[PDB]
Structure 1
């Protein structure tokens, strides 16, 4: 998955999240088309109670079926402030997309962080199963010990996501931020 955001001179906004599922998908090009084929079928629940590549589980609702669209976690998102488009965001991360985007919203609204600050802040994640509080590097040892004392099972893992966001000021001014987790990306305008 990869996510990108756009805001034009008129104030129109678009947030797109699209994917082949895993990196390069199946890695299979379709004949002489030069087009790589997705492995999105793994997003269905293959068997009730058995996790897929992201540790997600399902039952009848997300069971494989002909012509059915497998359940996704992709979350291109727009937050509105004072009746106007304010934050345009989204991110890759399979099951972690929901929590990564959630954190962008909380960081912006509750902590008042500018779009770059919200983007560079560390991320944590809990998806019920497996029962673990996944965290990135960046949280205070004092905080992590308090979480363990609360009963959380902290697991330090790989960095999560690649947010590509745009915040719109009260005067139409635009503010953007690419993710430190992704090299060679870019947020630019005019």
Structure 2
């Protein structure tokens, strides 16, 4: 998955999230065209496949011909009451997309972190099933302690949690950030 955020000089914006699903998709590359084909069928539930201990397959998300599988993607644009874009945000990272997008928004909108900090700040994730909270390796360990004393069991992410690209309007113009977790950088004028 990849997320891109764009604001043009006229104030119009695009938040776009695109995916072939797993790394390298289906692992089927055309030798002629070079196209690397998605494995988006894996995002459906299947009655015969248990994905997680104790978790039933979801019937709302079974395969039918012509159906689209449920996605965690959530490319978002926040607009102020005056009609000007405030934030363009989204994320990559499977089921961590939605929580990471929420966090980037919380971090900027409510905690008052600038856009680069909102992107770089450590994240955490819980999706109910499975029943664990995943935290990034550099999270404030007072947060880990606060979670554990409230009976959450935590685990540290082996790599990182999601990839966020964001733009926020400031007094100075359009502030942009790409996530160091994946290595991007923005550009503009």
TM-score by length of structure 1 reads 0.91
Question: Structure 1: how far apart are the matches of 2:49 and 2:176?
Answer: 41
Corresponding position of 1:168: 169
| Structure 2 match to 1:94 | 94
Does residue 117 of structure 1 match 2:117? yes
Alpha-carbon contact 1:48-1:59 (below 8 Å) kept = no
Q: Which runs of 4+ in 1 moved over 4 A?
A: none
1:67 aligned partner: 66
Name the counterpart of 1:149: 149
Distance 2:95 2:24 in 1: 18
C-alpha distance in 2, partners of 1:142/1:49?
39
CA distance in 2, matches of 1:78, 1:10: 15
**Pair 1:188–1:61, CA change in 2 (3 A):** same
Matched, 1:186 2:185: yes
Post-superposition offset of 1:51: 2.5
The TM-score with structure 2 as length reference comes to 0.91
Report how many aligned residue pairs link the two structures: 186
Q: Is the 8 A contact 1:45 1:57 kept in 2?
A: no
1: CA distance between counterparts of 2:105 and 2:141? 25
The residue aligned with 2:138 is 138
Could you say if the C-alpha distance between residues 49 and 24 of structure 1 is closer, same or farther in structure 2, counting changes exceeding 3 Å? closer
Q: Which runs of 5+ in 2 are unaligned?
A: none
Match of 1:47 in 2: 47
Post-superposition offset of 1:178: 0.9
Structure 1 unaligned segments of length 5 or more: list them: none
Instruction: Measure how far apart 1:95 and its partner are.
Output: 0.3
Instruction: Report the Cα offset of residue 149 of structure 1.
Output: 1.1
Shift of 1:143: 2.6
SS of residue in 1 equivalent to 2:60: coil
Tell me if structure 2 keeps the 8 A contact 1:2–1:18: yes
Q: Flag the 1:12–1:25 CA change in 2: closer, same or farther, 3 A.
A: same
How far does the alpha carbon of each residue in 1:20-59 deviate from its partner, in whole angstroms, 9 at most, with x for none?
001110121135111000000010001288327xxx8642
8 Å Cα contact 1:48-1:60 kept in structure 2: no
User: 2: CA distance between counterparts of 1:113 and 1:58?
Assistant: 39
Cα deviation digits, residues 134-169 of structure 1 (max 9, x gap): 110122333312211101010101201221111123
